[PDB]
Structure 1
Amino acid sequence: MRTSQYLLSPADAVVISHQLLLRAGMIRRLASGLYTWLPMGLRVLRKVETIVREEMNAAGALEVLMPAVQPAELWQESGRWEQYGPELLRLKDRHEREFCVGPTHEEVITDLARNELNSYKQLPINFYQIQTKFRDEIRPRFGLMRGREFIMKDAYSFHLSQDSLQQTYDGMYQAYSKIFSRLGLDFRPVQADNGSIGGSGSHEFHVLANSGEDDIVFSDSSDYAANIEKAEAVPRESARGSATEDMRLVDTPNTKTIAALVDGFQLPIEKTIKTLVVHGAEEGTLVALIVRGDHELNEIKAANQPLVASPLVFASEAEIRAAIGAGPGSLGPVNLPIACIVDRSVALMSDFAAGANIEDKHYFGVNWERDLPLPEVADLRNVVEGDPSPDGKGTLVIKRGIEVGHIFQLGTKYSEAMKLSVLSEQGKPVNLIMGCYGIGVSRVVAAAIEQNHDERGILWPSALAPFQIALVPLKYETESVKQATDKLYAELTAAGFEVLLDDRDKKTSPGVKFADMELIGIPHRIVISDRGLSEGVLEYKGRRDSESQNLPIGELMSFITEKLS
């Protein structure tokens, strides 16, 4: 009775995984960013959940299950009750007590550790759960990938020392790598934002897909791998060029953009700069950050600078004019009455053009040292295709990624705030050093399709297929065909395979049945017919296959065993 049950019965879905997940009856919308898992969709979901839980256990983590509803008072200990922003879904109960529906669980698990972790002989320990979160995304979109309710594997490890944290952290990296291999994904772990300049201890796991919202950077020869947020930028040139022009004021009443200098004044874009006035970390101060005309400011690198306020805030036009005496489109490093930091590539420029900090004027032929001192230099830009690999090996390619996991060395941020402390073996109170590890279990189901699909529909990796074999008769009411078919279901089920049986009547044509089984990603099809049973044979076709086959009935069970290998 299987298809007349599992198959059940788009207009806005724009990414392929969302459209296919809806068309294939894997999920359906309830409200904005809230999706029901349909019977066939839940079969795939649980397959993900099984592998992730197996590798978390094999890596020594202890599954727990914490509440969804959480006391605001915990979120007030970390300050995140306010600081988290409008993505936190806040509520009150019938007694006017305040809660959120958790998007994550750092406070709750730290609260647990306060009460449960009392001796150094219990450390290290790593707790994880597979549980529904809520995030009030301002614009839920992309189906399972930017929903509001989604499933998360979130894990939290506690340590007495940095080395202890690293070992567990390394084990999680390895377990994640096992997880996304068993899931049969084309993935890449990359270095990620750790809040600091340089250093380590933050890695993202990405599935490669041309719809990726993350840009991820790779050496074309070395193992270098990093989110563009983190990717160190080093300049292509080896030395600063020599001064070949004098500095001069140029009237620029209508030249206020990189485009206008390059196209209008014919300047090589390598001879232009963008100045970005941001707020200072010192209250009320301004900082000017400068990148070359053909580059962009990396905002994460920007806010990592000690002089720069984190998070990044851009100065207003009125602030800019009050400080500098000129406004956007006429700004530059010369006679700049505010602190400045220039990108590494900008320090090597020569004979370049800058806004003069005089309205409607630029300097042309600026040269560092001759016309003004070089200010502080830092890595402020994003890398671009073909940039040198920062490890000196090869050049950089940028690909698109869907983030499906993140691991992060958290330190003592929560154990300081929530007074989670344990005595070291020598008797010293130690603030527990924490790590956090997350996988977007929901997002994984969708990520797989973004990467594996064709014109016929979903292509599942082997571990995710909701069934392995579809039986399609083809006049299924024929006693001859219904007995061969029902026996075949039993044999194949007996041997352990997961078989979907298409029991729909003649009112559903064979071609439609074929297209349905293909759409839902079932990797093997078997068609039973009286004309083939006469000939003593069975018709086979693979999901990726071009033409069907005919297999002698007697050979079929060995043949399917081989395919499933």
Structure 2
Amino acid sequence: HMRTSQYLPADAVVISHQLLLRAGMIRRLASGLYTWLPMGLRVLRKVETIVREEMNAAGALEVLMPAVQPAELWQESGRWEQYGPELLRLKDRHEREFCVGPTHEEVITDLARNELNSYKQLPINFYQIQTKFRDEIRPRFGLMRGREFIMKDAYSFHLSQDSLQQTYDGMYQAYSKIFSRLGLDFRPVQADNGSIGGSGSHEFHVLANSGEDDIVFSDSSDYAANIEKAEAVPRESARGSATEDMRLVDTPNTKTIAALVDGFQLPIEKTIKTLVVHGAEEGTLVALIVRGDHELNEIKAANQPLVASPLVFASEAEIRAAIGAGPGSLGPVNLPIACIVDRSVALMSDFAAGANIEDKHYFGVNWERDLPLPEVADLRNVVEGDPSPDGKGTLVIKRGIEVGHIFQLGTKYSEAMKLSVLSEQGKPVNLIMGCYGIGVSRVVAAAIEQNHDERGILWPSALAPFQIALVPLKYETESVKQATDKLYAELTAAGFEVLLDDRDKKTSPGVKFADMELIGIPHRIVISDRGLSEGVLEYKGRRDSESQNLPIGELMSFITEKL
């Protein structure tokens, strides 16, 4: 028998973390390090089973690579340094250097250059379900920002871009099947691939109110993207006419949009933010301008050719030396550095701008009349109700928990690590690669974030640790004991996963009921002598308002249907 006597705050702030602790599914060992207790492991394994099945069905080959990895491989890719401090670095007893793997691009590439020597082996897609380590600066949110976590990571190798796309498409489809079978409300979205436009990366998000990531959808089309990636187009069709002459105004204590809007009674749509960043050309600055009610999108900013990637903001001293004034008094008029303005900015008229002189602004600025319009680009974040960039409907912003991310890597790794195979024609080809990650331990948490109530966890059917809780009242009575054990055996025989509450009188029936519901068991059966005498059992669903009575004989028929 599987029995309750065996199986069953402060740092816990999100609901999934709180309930995983309370339901006896995990325990903290240290910052970002959790043990799966017996009840939680059951859930984790059900996630793992569905992932494996769908990866297998998509033709991927399961491997299992080491956690500890030699530094030399990471030095080949440059990530030994470039990965940053989330990379856990160490030395062994021989003073040799290693990391604990946060991901396995380098290891799989090393494998690939030894094991792939014929075009007849391609395409091929290896995956593993394996424990990663990432030295997250502030481990939090329980399983969702852990240090040690389970990921399914897959890596595909190809002789052509078109081949990669075929596998990538299959992985996207597989992912959809995975999250559907896990019974999660989820959405795939376009994600940043490090260039303007393109479609070489997608995320899969579980929809939840606590979700850290903003995702954007058209209400009328298939348009879907992370806010990092979401294309912003202007609400206005044309630039307004010039109705005011430009003029220099004294503006002491005016260094924010609010101070400008409230101080001088300007509409926010007549103001701008000027952000100064480092240019790609060494020692240069670029000014990026968005309208006052908007925000600079730092991915869009870095993806501009003129702008250094990754994105570095100019210091105040850099700004003052270059421009002749500091933050708060900046603008495009008499600006001695390169400038890029957001699409919305290009359509503005009679607008205000810091004068590039301390504590002054120009009012009544108009493009063309008072200064040339600079380069225009999509620089801003979309906001709720903006037009869909495909021209079909308007945008809506939801919160999402990232559980999957897929990537087209081109030849980044194969070039650096000399992974090449001869074509049928005999041309050496650097293999084109994709990689595909699911946060498996994250998924367990994400499910609770999405699915919970006042009584505790609600699992999707695929994730429930057990299907049926048997709650005997006074299990010490032979009639009950026999009636319960018989029920356990039949149900277990019929392939159902049953938990038998074997706890003594010192655990009340109410406590028992609340426990089975906290843990998220979808069905309970209650056995008692009062009921055995009348040939009835007491059944209740997890999301049923009321219990009901079930003739002992019809039970198996009735339970089978539900499950």
TM-score, structure 1 as length reference: 0.99
The superposition leaves residues 134-182 of structure 1 with CA deviations (integer Å, 9 ceiling, x where unpaired) of: 0000000000000000000000000000000000000000000000000
C-alpha distance in structure 2 between counterparts of 1:359 and 1:457, whole Å: 57
Separation in 2 of the partners of 1:442 and 1:529?
39
For residues 69 and 510 of structure 1, the distance between their equivalents in structure 2, rounded to whole angstroms, comes to 49
Cα distance, 1:306 vs structure 2: 0.3
Q: Secondary structure at the match of 1:436?
A: strand
Distance in 1, Cα, partners of 2:496 & 2:82: 50
Q: Counterpart of 2:67?
A: 68
Unaligned runs of 5+ in 2: none
Give per-residue Cα distances to partners, 1:465-488, cap 9 Å, x unaligned: 000000001111011111110000
Alpha-carbon distance between aligned partners in 2 of 1:164 and 1:118, rounded to the nearest angstrom:
17
Give the drift of 1:221.
Answer: 1.2
How far apart, CA to CA, are the structure 1 residues paired with 2:453 and 2:561?
A: 24
Write the distance in 2 (CA, Å) between the matches of 1:434 and 1:33: 31
The answer on 1:212 being equivalent to 2:211 is yes
Moved over 3 A (4+): none
For residues 385-404 of structure 1, the aligned pairs below 5 Å read 385-404=384-403
Query: Following the alignment from structure 2 to structure 1, what is the Cα–Cα distance between the partners of residues 53 and 65?
Result: 19
How far does residue 253 in structure 1 lie from its aligned partner after superposition? 1.0
2-structure distance, mates of 1:417, 1:201: 20
Structure 1 position 369, deviation (Å) = 0.2
Residue 12 of structure 1: how far off its partner (Å)? 1.7
Q: Write the distance in 2 (CA, Å) between the matches of 1:65 and 1:251.
A: 67
Asked whether 1:4 is paired with 2:5, we answer yes
Q: C-alpha offsets along residues 220-249 of structure 1, whole Å, 9 cap, x if unaligned?
A: 111100000000000000000000000000
Q: Deviations over 1:263-315 (max 9, x none)?
A: 11110000000000000111100000000000000000000000000011010
The residue number in structure 2 matching 1:411 is 410
Q: Deviations over 1:447-500 (max 9, x none)?
A: 000000000000000000000000001111011111110000001001100000
Percentage of matched positions with identical amino acids: 100
Deviation at 1:555, TM superposition (A): 0.9
Partner of 2:204, secondary structure, is: strand
Give the equivalent residue in structure 1 for 2:499.
500
Which whole-Å CA distance do the structure 1 matches of 2:418 and 2:533 have between them? 78
TM (norm. structure 2) is: 0.99
Does 1:230 find its partner at 2:229?
yes
Summarize deviations over 1:88-127 as a string: whole Å, max 9, x none: 0000000000000000000000000010000001000000
Q: Deviations over 1:540-565 (max 9, x none)?
A: 0000111110001111111111111x
CA-to-aligned-CA distance 1:333-367 (integer Å, 9 cap, x gap)? 00000000000000000000000101110000000
Aligned residues: 561
Alignment match, 1:450: 449
* Secondary structure in structure 1 of the residue aligned to 2:398: strand
Q: What is the CA-CA distance between 1:536 and the residue it aligns to?
A: 1.0
**SS of the residue 1:144 aligns to:** coil
- The Cα shift of 1:204 comes to 0.1
Cα distance in 2 between the residues matched to 1:143 and 1:304 = 33
Q: Deviations over 1:389-422 (max 9, x none)?
A: 0011110000000000001001000000000011
How far apart, CA to CA, are the structure 2 residues paired with 1:81 and 1:407?
A: 22
* Equivalent residue number for residue 33 of structure 1: 32
CA distance in 1, matches of 2:400, 2:319: 37
String of CA shifts for 1:351-386, please: whole Å, max 9, x gaps.
Answer: 000001011100000000000000000000000000
CA distance in 2, matches of 1:481, 1:80: 63
After superposition, the C-alpha distances for 1:314-333 in whole angstroms (9 at most, x for unaligned) are 10000000000111111000
1:426 aligns with 2:431: no
Alpha-carbon shift at residue 35 of structure 1 (Å): 0.1
SS state of the match for residue 145, structure 1? coil
- 1:535, distance to aligned residue in structure 2 (A): 1.2
Deviations 1:7-26 (A, max 9, x none): xxx22200000000000000
Distance in 1, matches of 2:159 and 2:52, equals: 26
Cα offset for 1:446?
Answer: 0.2
Distance (whole Å) between structure 1 residues aligned to residue 419 and residue 37 of structure 2: 42
Whether 1:538 aligns to 2:540 is no
SS in 2 for 1:54: helix
Q: RMSD between aligned alpha carbons?
A: 0.5
Distance 1:130 1:255 in 2: 55
CA distance in 2, matches of 1:525, 1:201: 47
1:226 and 1:419 mapped to 2: Cα distance? 34
In the aligned structure 1, how far is the partner of 2:43 from the partner of 2:327? 53
1:254 Cα deviation from its structure 2 partner: 1.1
2:104 aligns to what?
A: 105
Alignment of 1:93-242 (within 5 A): 93-242=92-241
**1:255 positional shift:** 1.1
Q: Distance in 2 between matches of 1:324 and 1:503?
A: 76
How far 1:76 sits from its partner (Å)? 0.2
Q: Whole-Å Cα distance in 1 between the matches of residues 527 and 298 of structure 2?
A: 61
Distance 1:454 1:263 in 2: 44
CA apart distance, 1:201: 1.6
Deviations 1:33-73 (A, max 9, x none): 00000000000000000000000000000000000000000
